[PDB]
Design a protein around this ligand. Structure first.
Ligand SMILES: COc1ccc(NC(=O)Nc2cccs2)cn1
Length: 460
């Protein structure tokens, strides 16, 4: 039975509004309702992995798992296996997978982050799950960020705390946060970004929604605008939104947005907003295609509608050769030529590189680079032709061209990373000098760039 080169992944996010769900929620898992929806002809075809994020979830783990499993069984006639479940307060993540994947899934990690301090610590934060699916690392984050139209900066701070402190994936990748640890990272939740229009425009916004005219609303969505200004979710993707705002509804119908200030809202307006989102970040040149992104119309127990997104995602096999794993394959090598880092830092320490990859036995430290002053005030760290030759464990091009090299640039003085990036080995040619490039980030913010040339030797 051959190993897959693709899987499909369902991502769900639902703020349940502290209310139990209705008896039928199959529309969510079928990607039916508004937006980019799934074809009826696929309804019986199970996804490989279902990842369910809830917020304001009033159920026990047992109660929600029973509902999820019985839902998927009704749809697919498959009894899904529980990969992981993790809850922080009323924020929950469930990962289910087809039984045939049980022996493909390993290295399961869970963690949470609590955001805020004192007043603002006690209900917001994130839960996450990571695991290996054969040769491919998968990370999943469900976050409930700070609420309120006037708190977009707080949400951006919540995001940075979550990506710094959520401990998922391979702990040997010590310079790297979750935005570099995974082949595919999915980040979803009640991100709580609002449509930033005046309160007086509430009825005009409602009109626009009834006409399915979302363009003038999305142009004011705080998540889109903050992402355009590189304030949050740098280097993440989001499918185009073609569904109505998923908040704030009167419960038990979808006919009414409940936006007016009430004692129950702390006298805050809740203009219709796309609070409930799914974003992703995959390593360069790995296949990932969003095949649905939408909201249900028929689940009305909460003041939020459920959101679904589905993806085709490239996966690789757990490669064995006569040589690697447990030795090198002299026939393979990775060379870096004419490489330099450009850093936004004011620091004048010397820097070195670390090269991390599951195609290496262990990470590789470079010699210190040569600092020069760049014209426009920046630091340029030149490595020229000094970088070590990397010795992959397997030289077969079917393996090596699918791999990635994580790069950290570190201070000689403090051994702290000033920037992290990723280079694909999915090259146009082997035994040929080719340009490479990655932006460098630290704590998920832009700190520089790394560019140069690569020369990859495979067994072919
Ligand atoms: C390689 O990482 C990425 C990922 C996405 C992108 N493009 C964007 O982020 N485009 C956006 C327009 C407005 C908000 S965001 C570039 N590089």
């Amino acid at each position: 039975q051959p190993e897959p080169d693709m899987i499909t992944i369902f991502i769900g996010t639902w703020n349940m509004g502290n209310a139990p769900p209705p008896k039928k929620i199959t529309s969510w898992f079928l990607s039916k309702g508004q937006g980019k929806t799934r074809d009826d002809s696929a309804d019986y075809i199970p996804h490989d992995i279902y990842v369910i994020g809830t917020q304001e979830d009033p159920l026990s783990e047992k109660e929600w798992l029973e509902i999820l499993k019985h839902s998927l069984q009704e749809i697919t006639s498959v009894t899904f296996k529980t990969v992981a479940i993790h809850t922080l307060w009323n924020i929950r993540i469930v990962v289910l997978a087809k039984p045939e994947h049980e022996n493909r899934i390993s290295h399961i990690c869970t963690d949470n982050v609590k955001t805020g301090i004192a007043n603002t610590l006690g209900n917001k934060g994130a839960v996450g799950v990571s695991f290996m699916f054969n040769g491919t690392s998968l990370g999943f984050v469900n976050s409930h960020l700070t609420s309120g139209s006037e708190k977009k900066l707080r949400r951006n701070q919540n995001y940075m705390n979550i990506l710094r402190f959520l401990a998922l994936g391979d702990k040997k990748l010590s310079p790297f946060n979750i935005t570099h640890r995974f082949t595919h990272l999915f980040w979803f939740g009640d991100l709580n970004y609002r449509v930033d229009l005046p309160t007086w425009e509430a009825e005009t916004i409602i009109q626009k929604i009834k006409q399915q005219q979302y363009a003038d609303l999305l142009s004011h969505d705080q998540l889109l605008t903050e992402r355009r200004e590189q304030k949050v979710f740098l280097h993440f993707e989001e499918e185009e939104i073609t569904f109505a705002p998923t908040y704030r509804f009167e419960r038990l119908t979808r006919d009414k947005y409940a936006y007016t200030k009430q004692k129950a809202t702390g006298m805050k307006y809740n203009l219709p907003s796309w609070c409930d989102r799914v974003l992703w970040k995959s390593y360069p040149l790995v296949h990932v295609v969003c095949q649905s992104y939408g909201s249900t119309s028929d689940i009305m127990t909460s003041d939020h509608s459920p959101v679904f997104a589905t993806f085709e995602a490239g996966v690789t096999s757990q490669f064995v050769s006569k040589n690697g794993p447990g030795t090198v394959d002299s026939q393979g090598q990775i060379e870096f030529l004419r490489c330099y880092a450009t850093l936004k830092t004011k620091s004048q320490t010397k820097f070195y590189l670390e090269f991390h990859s599951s195609c290496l036995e262990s990470f590789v430290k470079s010699q210190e680079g040569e600092n020069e002053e760049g014209s426009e005030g920046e630091l340029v760290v030149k490595f020229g032709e000094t970088l070590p030759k990397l010795k992959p464990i397997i030289s077969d091009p079917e393996y090596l061209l699918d791999q990635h090299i994580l790069i950290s640039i570190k201070s000689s003085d403090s051994d702290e990373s000033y920037g992290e990036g990723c280079i694909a080995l999915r090259l146009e040619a082997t035994e040929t000098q080719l340009p490479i490039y990655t932006p460098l980030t630290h704590h998920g913010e832009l700190t520089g760039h790394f560019q140069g040339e690569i020369k990859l030797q495979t067994s072919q």
